[model samples]
Target: AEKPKLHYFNARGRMESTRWLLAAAGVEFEEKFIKSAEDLDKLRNDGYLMFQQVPMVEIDGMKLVQTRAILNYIASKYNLYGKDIKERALIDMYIEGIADLGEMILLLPVCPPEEKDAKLALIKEKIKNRYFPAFEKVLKSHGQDYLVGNKLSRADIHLVELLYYVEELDSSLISSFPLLKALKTRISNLPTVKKFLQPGSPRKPPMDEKSLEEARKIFRF
Candidate 1:
């Protein structure tokens, strides 16, 4: 079988979650990094992008676009979506909340320098006052290792990924949310996820200036 081929810039923008999903599924995949605007144009001309935007993935012989759509397919195919409709609903709810938090972090790199500090402060506040508390409550309510079901699901993987991103902003962010902190540990230690965390994995580092500039050029944002 041909492995999934992910097309996106080298940064961990919308595509990072897809990488996390695939990696957690124990799938090996390839990536085509868009180095310039022309690369994007070529992909668009090739009709591989449904929305003319990236984070497009070629998997199971289909050209998948849109982060949520890609995530849903991967999670379902790999048995990480949840066992039934009710479980899937909870997983989707949790995932949406996590993605909301993840979006703020994702946009930080493109924020103006003058507003960056304030933005970071806001994110920290939301994590502490809003996001973390909700997730902590869920974990406490269930006393389960995973969020939606007894087994790991997309919700858990997404939360763990967001937890790492938040930790990068402030190492102490998870201190108050013991359950979330423990959840991070459990998820991160999974063999597949742990391998992805190793130095040479496809996981990209925090967005740097060079990658940011390249992304801006490619997306014209």
Candidate 2:
């Protein structure tokens, strides 16, 4: 049997969870980091991928597309998708919600400068008023543990990773929502998550004190 090759398009933005999942599973894999747009253009061409995208995983001569799908596939196989049917649905639902938020963020860069302020303002409003409270409601309803099932499922990891990006995107954003902080703290305390988050994680767009403050206020309110 041949080993699977995980080609992560090295960027510090959001793919950390999948990378961490693969690492936690202890599956020996290759790390091909394309550090530049030029590299991405060249690499994306090599695999016959007409559409340029990173985090493409090739296994058993088949190419798996999309990060969330790949993460779900791995989590299912690794016993991280949880056991119950409803729990699994909840897991998917949880991550799906976060995926929606992530998509909104991907548009920030392309936003015109003059309109950027308004765009960010809109993001702050929706995230704080909608996503934050909703997540908090879930956390408050359930005990201070995993998001979906009693066990640590993909949703748990996804929440932590997704929120970590949000936190990094703006730390102050989540502060007003106490439940969100509690949720984050819960995941941060986990052994695997703790270790993976240690220094040298190669975080891109390194969030500074001010941006984090900007983020916190944006989300927490």
Candidate 3:
């Protein structure tokens, strides 16, 4: 057959998990970076991406769309989704939780300028008070490393991407969550994950030390 071609922006936005999945599975695939409107327009013109969006993948002579859907497909095929029904259900829950937080974040660049700051503030508050703590509890209560079944699942990899995204958006964020901090180190250091996270890899963003102290304080109280 043919090699899988992952189409996404040059940055690690929505397709980070999908990229990690392919890497962790030792699946060799080529990435088609979409760097400009013209590149995306070409896909649209060719009718290759039904939705005409990045984060789509073409493999096994089929085209796949949607970030989460693509990740699920990868996990299922690679034995990373879950080990059993209960595990699969838990994995699904965590994935949806990530998506919930993502929806709030998607508003940051689109809301009115006056509201953008408030939206960002809200995003930080939600992450610090809710998402981080919730994830911390999962780690503390469940598997110390991975998120489900005490093994690496799409959820674990997805959280690595999610946590990294938060850190890039605001460095001070997520530090207070001890398990998340530990999980970040553990997963990122996995042989495959480490390879993908090299010094100049596209999977990571430039360091930003800007702290969100107020957001961090929410968990302390």
Quote each prediction's TM-score.
0.96, 0.77, 0.82
Select the stronger candidate by lDDT from 2 and 3.
3
| Model 2 per-residue lDDT at 85 | 85
- Cα error of candidate 2 at position 175, Å: 2.1
The best candidate in terms of lDDT: 1
Would you give me the overall lDDT of model 2? 0.67
Per-residue lDDT tens digits for candidate 3, residues 49-86, read: 87866678997777888887787778898899898899
**How many residue pairs of model 3 clash at the backbone?**
0
- How close to the true structure is residue 138 of candidate 3, measured as C-alpha lDDT? 92
Candidate 1: lDDT of 93? 88
- Residues 1-221 of candidate 2 have per-residue lDDT tens digits of 54656554444334566776765555555656654456656766777343456566765566776777678788887788878787788777777887788777765654678999988888878888988777888878876577776677777666677677777568889888787777678777776666666775433354455644543343232
Looking at model 2, the pairs that clash are 170-215, 170-216, 171-216, 172-216, 172-217, 173-215, 173-216, 173-219, 173-220, 176-220
Model 1 local distance difference test score: 0.91
The deviation in Å at residue 172 for candidate 3 is: 2.9
Clash statistics: count for each candidate: 0, 10, 0
RMSD score of candidate 1 (Å): 1.1
